[PDB]
């Protein structure tokens, strides 16, 4: 989110760590791929935003806007370096489901109702510290629709700040960082 | 002056002998080969504007007195060498930092961006025009032509036409189109978008993905070919507006939320307005309503139900869930708690309007036959309904009435949508030397010279524009007198014809004359008689021209006189002229004043109808006529309304219907036991002051059966005038924190006491002063501008060669770049110099006045005189602080008053529009209305400077963009002002100590934003808000009359009325054969005029609103 | 429905498919309770659900 400028370095280093692909091949496979330029049209800005309007991909459906510069750049990566239009929109959603958080509904049907990232919710210095928030959340949302009994007839959500409304703008509530870290030390 | 004065002279000789640039004359003044001459320029062409090698012509002041002050400053306590006035440890670093800066002259910003002395001023011909038309370039893409030269046409249109490829190419790629998926949730970055013109047309909507289930709205119909698509006029224009409000919500809400979380403390509306349209345009649920619950309290006014919403105060719950803010026009707590304790006087009582239906309800229930001879006649019973006892035999008054009134703002209705296209022909979007408000009037008196016209060469020089709006006029002109030569069309065979002088054919237009020119024409010839003779004259000629004013002339004469003598048409001929032309030059009957005046008490003028003795057999005179129908159609309409209708239900002229009521109150001596007041509304003579209010009135209380009997209508009412509060809301919060004025006067909390009232009083009068006196016409404000730059200095070139009375490039650059925005800040600058006038006039005094403003405005000593001798005939001034006027008819007529209104202009003018840079101001003392406008000129030189602006003006040559979003503001807040400043005015009375609650309730933010969006000239332009929106008052004057069933209705004739070709439905056949009920495209027609200019189509004016205020920063509160 | 069955308390899903199945109007389309083929159609559905 800092430097969304040259995502591809962190394409680079994600699978030297967590698959196990030594660099001297994905070197080859660059050079290899210098003669031939695929640009079968493609890239430009009407197939990203008919890619992003379909209810098959569940996870590039839904996407903070803080968000958009990245997964472009990891897509173009992607489909630059292998031959596949469909092997693309995959590790895309896997990179996007490992950096971030879904929150889901009590009903028996388990529609999504958010999606956050893995740094509006740490809580102190040790990088495991985002196990918290969620809970602080969900429990949150469970102790506020209990207090309103109409809130069922419109839409809870949690939109990315971090914000809890409803489609009417009457309940609007924000989630501060330092009064939680203040707070649990003492508790 | 009281300076300079030398070099001057020396410029003034240089450029005789014939020197260009400043290179020349710098080389000259200082030898090269001594003493640098390289950053001696720069300093130079930096203060000034002009580059260094680009030509002068130093016969202009604005290049002259401009380059004489950038060079004695280079020439020669005192901080750092301060070009303003006031009226307007050192070891670390601190003295290495202070002493090195050196001091420059200050930046022009109007010269660096725009550069406006290069422009050329050539005048266009037809097949220059010809060829630009035929060469196929859309209208945004003028401003590069504009300005050139002759030799350089096909050039510049190469260019154009090379960007509009461009253009088409990026759009085609799929760049701009990211705008419909929304803002809320996942979509574009709203400070960060920059649309593409061009795709007015293509037609798209609103559909957010967040609020729909994807079974609901399956997919997309791929995308436009981008070669055939079009639109009409309004049905897909709303989903438009709605895209660009939007985007203007969007932002905002981004720009509160950085600058709340950034100190450590607009989200309501953007989401509910979003959840509308998205559930709108798929037919879903709509997610955006929050029900009544049981046992909660609720109120009602004028038959509305309400009660109030929890965590947001100010707005206010419908009865099926709709939530509306505090700001909106039609909220019915506002209005309560207005009429309530802000402003009593101008009650609901004072605003109310029942229609003919209640008057002749109770009119109907009478004793006295005669009365009631006439009753059955003027009024329709309601005791019929298939059970009438009598009314049968045909149409009555009533009846007349509503179908004509039904008609007419049809009409007005498209005559706005047809008049506002043309004005984007490139004839007038190219024409820089001449002000933008002469526009319509010229249109207007372009096509009524060519309709009377019978060779029809004038009809072949029209552009292709105007060709609808002369057919519109030609064909109702037709009709109204085809139906007042013959009133038996209605149902009734013994009604005669009211029409003076039928025999022979044509088309007439009514006749006003003004009467400043005839002032003007009878000071030049010295005599009222010289204009007689010279009327009479330009009449006779006509007579000897034509064959066919011979043949009228002289079969009339023939007819009116028995005798026959081939001698007596040569007395018989001038003896009728000479009482005509006496008619006109030794009274006032025909002016505009007597026709056209406001309001009357009682019936004063009904014997004689004016707007019928204007004809005449004959045939310059149009010298003395007026040219302006927005303000003369309506009136002629009304009148003529009234005696058709008097005429074709009783059967008695206007005149017999008159005498009748004191023939009757002859015998009202006795203390016996509404005929006056039912033929005074019959007529068109009610008071019709703030008729806007009733306007809206109407709609707020009949909301409810459009909600039941359509959808779609009511969500698009709900969404425009919603955009419209937001808007009012975001330009009070950014007024708050810029201007320290606004801030003063809203941060009140008690009385003010002694000095304050007395300009808080001057600041009212001023306005009145101004509104009472002003010209009506456009040739006398250009003679009156023009006598006074002859009365400063000119040469016999000048009067000579083009020169000519159009003048806007004699001005300074400020008026020819960015031109409509200047006149509301010259328009109160007036205001306020009219008053300390006349204050001086009356109390003698001298802390602001000054003698140097005779010898600058050009006034000799009589006029002077004769001013100050008037005003202190006509006004007083009351211990208490109020101005009073004695007479108001006749101080309007009179020769000084034109000398006032041009002192106070050119004052005005000269001391605070011309002088550029802040340095440059001398004055002795400012005044109340002096600050104001100089805060809000400083507002705009910031906004200017920024860099959004002189991006946007790098990528497209497109100036006409930024006049129209820098134009709302100052509309706005100087709507602001005087609420304020009446609202502290009226609390200064309450002797308890009740002004602190009243000051608590009238001057919160919620009031202000409401008080200047429904105040202010957003109306429906020069038309108005009562004439574009007043004909919903049939569907109210429909359902009262049987409620105090059935309707079966006959079957609309196969012909129905969706389908009818425009032009050709308001002849004679369109008016007796049409339906006059209410359907929903009056709802939504009405709706969006009312709200074109400040909610357009296109989202430029938008994003610049948008990146302005970003820079700037609003008040956060809290 | 969920309105007259609260969706905490008992399903309120499988009693819904039963609803939109026997009537034809789809779970979020809009409604227009003021006509009488869309009135008596729901009155009917229902009755027999709660016996």
């Known amino acids: 989110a800092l430097y ?184 | 002056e009281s300076g300079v004065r030398a070099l001057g002279k020396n410029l003034l000789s240089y450029g005789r002998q014939g020197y260009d640039s400043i290179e020349k004359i710098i080389n000259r003044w200082a030898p090269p080969n001594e003493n640098d001459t390289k950053a001696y320029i720069d300093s130079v062409v930096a203060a000034t504007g002009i580059p ?135 979509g574009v970055d709203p400070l960060t978008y920059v649309p593409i013109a061009g795709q007015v047309g293509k037609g798209g909507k609103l559909v957010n993905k967040m609020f729909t289930v994807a ?23 709303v989903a438009e507006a709605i895209l660009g409000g939007a985007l203007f919500g969007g932002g905002m809400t981004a720009i509160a939320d950085g600058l709340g979380r950034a100190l450590g403390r607009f989200a309501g509306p953007a989401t509910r307005l979003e959840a509308r349209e998205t559930a709108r345009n798929v037919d879903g649920q709509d997610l955006s309503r929050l029900p009544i619950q049981e046992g909660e309290q609720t109120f009602s006014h004028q038959g509305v139900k309400f009660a109030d919403v929890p965590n947001e105060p100010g707005s206010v719950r419908l009865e099926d869930g709709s939530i509306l803010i505090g700001e909106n026009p039609l909220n019915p707590k506002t209005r309560q708690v207005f009429d309530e304790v802000i402003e009593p006087e101008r009650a609901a009582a004072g605003v109310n309007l029942g229609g003919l239906t209640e008057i002749g309800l109770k009119l109907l229930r009478s004793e006295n036959p005669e009365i009631r001879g006439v009753a059955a006649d003027l009024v329709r019973s309601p005791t019929g309904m298939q059970s009438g006892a009598s009314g049968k035999i045909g149409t009555t008054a009533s009846d007349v009435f509503e179908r004509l009134r039904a008609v007419d703002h049809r009409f007005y209705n498209d005559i706005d949508d047809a008049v506002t296209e043309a004005l984007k022909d490139p004839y007038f979007q190219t024409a820089f030397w001449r002000d933008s408000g002469a526009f319509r009037q010229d249109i207007y008196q372009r096509v009524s010279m060519a309709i009377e016209d019978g060779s029809g060469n004038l009809k072949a020089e029209l552009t292709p524009g105007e060709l609808k709006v002369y057919d519109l006029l030609k064909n109702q002109f037709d009709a109204k007198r085809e139906m007042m030569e013959n009133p038996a069309m209605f149902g009734r065979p013994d009604a005669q014809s009211i029409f003076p002088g039928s025999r022979f054919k044509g088309t007439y237009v009514p006749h006003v004359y003004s009467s400043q020119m005839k002032e003007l024409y009878i000071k030049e010839l010295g005599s009222p008689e010289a204009l007689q003779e010279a009327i009479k004259k330009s009449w006779l000629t006509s007579y000897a021209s034509r064959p066919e004013v011979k043949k009228r002339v002289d079969e009339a004469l023939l007819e009116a006189d028995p005798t026959l003598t081939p001698e007596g048409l040569a007395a018989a001929v001038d003896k009728y002229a000479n009482d005509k032309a006496y008619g006109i030059s030794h009274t006032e009957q025909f002016e505009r004043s007597s026709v056209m005046e406001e309001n009357i008490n009682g019936l004063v003028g009904l014997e004689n109808n004016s707007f019928l003795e204007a004809r005449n057999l004959f045939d310059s005179v149009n010298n003395l006529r007026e040219w302006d129908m927005d303000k003369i159609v309506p009136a002629y309409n009304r009148r003529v309304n009234g005696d058709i209708a008097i005429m074709a239900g009783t059967g008695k002229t206007t005149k017999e219907m008159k005498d009748l009521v004191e023939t009757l109150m002859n015998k009202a001596g006795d203390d016996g036991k509404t005929l006056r007041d039912t033929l005074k509304i019959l007529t068109g003579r009610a008071r019709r002051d703030g008729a806007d209010d009733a306007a809206f009135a109407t709609v707020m209380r009949t909301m409810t059966d459009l909600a039941f009997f359509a959808k779609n209508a009511y969500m698009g009412v709900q969404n425009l005038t919603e955009i419209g509060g937001m808007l009012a809301r975001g330009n009070v919060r950014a007024m708050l924190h810029g201007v320290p004025m606004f801030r003063d006067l809203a941060f009140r909390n008690k009385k003010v006491g002694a000095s304050e009232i007395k300009d808080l009083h001057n600041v009212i009068f001023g306005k009145e002063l101004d509104d009472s006196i002003r010209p009506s016409k456009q040739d006398v404000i250009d003679r009156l501008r023009s006598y006074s730059d002859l009365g400063r200095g000119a040469a016999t070139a000048l009067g000579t060669a083009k020169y000519y009375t159009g003048e806007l490039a004699v001005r300074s650059p400020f008026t020819k770049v960015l031109n409509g925005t200047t006149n509301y800040l010259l328009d109160a600058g007036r205001q306020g110099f009219l008053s300390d006038i006349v204050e001086h006039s009356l109390t003698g005094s001298k802390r602001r006045f000054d003698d140097r403003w005779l010898k600058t405005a050009g006034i000799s000593d009589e006029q002077w005189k004769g001013i100050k001798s008037l005003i202190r005939e006509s006004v007083t001034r009351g211990p208490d602080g109020k101005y009073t006027i004695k007479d108001k008819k006749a101080f309007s007529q009179d020769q000084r008053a034109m000398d006032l209104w041009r002192m106070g202009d050119t004052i005005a003018d000269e001391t605070l529009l011309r002088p550029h840079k802040l340095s440059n101001m001398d004055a002795k003392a400012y005044g109340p209305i002096a600050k104001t406008v100089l805060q809000f000129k400083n507002f705009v030189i910031k906004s200017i400077n920024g860099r959004t602006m002189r991006t946007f003006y790098n990528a497209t040559k497109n100036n006409r963009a930024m006049d129209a979003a820098l134009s709302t503001v100052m509309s706005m807040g100087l709507a602001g002002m005087y609420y304020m400043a009446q609202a502290h005015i009226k609390a200064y009375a309450m002797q308890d100590g009740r002004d602190r609650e009243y000051l608590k309730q009238a001057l919160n933010p919620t009031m202000i ?65 049409a339906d006059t009920r209410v359907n929903e495209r009056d709802y939504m027609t009405g709706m969006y005029n009312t709200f074109r200019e400040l909610v357009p189509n296109d989202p430029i004016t938008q994003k610049l609103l948008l990146g302005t205020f970003e820079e700037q920063g609003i008040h956060i509160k809290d």
């Open chain 1, 4 to 187: 969304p400028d040259q995502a591809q370095l962190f394409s680079t280093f994600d699978q030297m760590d967590k698959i196990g692909l030594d660099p001297q091949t994905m070197i080859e496979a660059d050079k290899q791929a210098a003669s031939q330029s695929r640009e079968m049209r493609m890239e430009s800005d009407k197939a990203w935003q008919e890619l992003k309007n379909d209810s098959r991909n569940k996870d590039l459906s839904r996407l903070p806007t803080s968000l958009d510069a990245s997964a472009r750049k990891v897509w173009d990566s992607w489909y630059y370096r292998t031959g596949n239009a469909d092997a693309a929109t995959q590790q895309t959603q896997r990179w996007l489901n490992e950096n971030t958080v879904t929150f889901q509904s009590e009903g028996s049907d388990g529609k999504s109702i958010g999606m956050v990232s893995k740094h509006q919710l740490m809580v102190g210095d040790n990088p495991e510290s985002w196990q918290v928030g969620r809970d602080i959340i969900d429990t949150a949302r469970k102790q506020l629709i209990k207090a309103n009994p109409w809130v069922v007839n419109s839409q809870l959500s949690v939109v990315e700040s971090i914000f809890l409304q409803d489609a009417t703008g009457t309940i609007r509530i924000r989630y501060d960082k330092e009064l939680v870290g203040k707070l649990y030390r003492e508790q």
């Open chain 2, 215 to 237: 079974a609901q709205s399956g997919a997309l119909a791929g995308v436009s070919e981008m070669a055939r698509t079009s639109v009409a006029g309004g049905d897909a224009h």
């Open chain 2, 52 to 186: 260094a090698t680009q030509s002068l012509d130093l016969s202009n002041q604005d290049t002259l007195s401009a380059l004489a002050q950038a060079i004695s400053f280079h020439e020669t306590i005192s901080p750092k060498t301060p070009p303003v006035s006031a009226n307007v440890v050192k070891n670390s670093m601190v003295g290495v930092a202070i002493r090195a800066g050196q001091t420059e002259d200050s930046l022009d910003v109007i010269g660096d961006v725009f550069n406006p002395t290069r422009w050329n001023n050539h005048k266009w011909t037809r097949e220059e025009l010809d060829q630009i038309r035929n060469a196929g370039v859309l209208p945004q893409y003028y401003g590069v032509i504009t300005g050139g030269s002759p030799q350089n046409l096909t050039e510049l249109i190469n260019l154009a036409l090379e960007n509009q490829k461009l253009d088409q190419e990026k759009a085609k790629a799929g760049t701009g189109a990211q705008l419909a998926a929304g803002v809320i949730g996942a």
């Open chain 2, 1009 to 1073: 934003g409401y008080a200047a969006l429904s105040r202010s000239s957003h109306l429906g332009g020069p038309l108005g808000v009562a004439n574009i929106l007043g004909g919903i008052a049939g569907y109210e004057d429909t359902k009262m009359l049987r409620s105090s069933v059935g309707n079966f209705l006959e079957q609309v004739p196969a012909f129905g009325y969706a389908a009818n070709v425009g032009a050709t439905a308001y002849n004679l056949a369109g008016y007796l054969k």
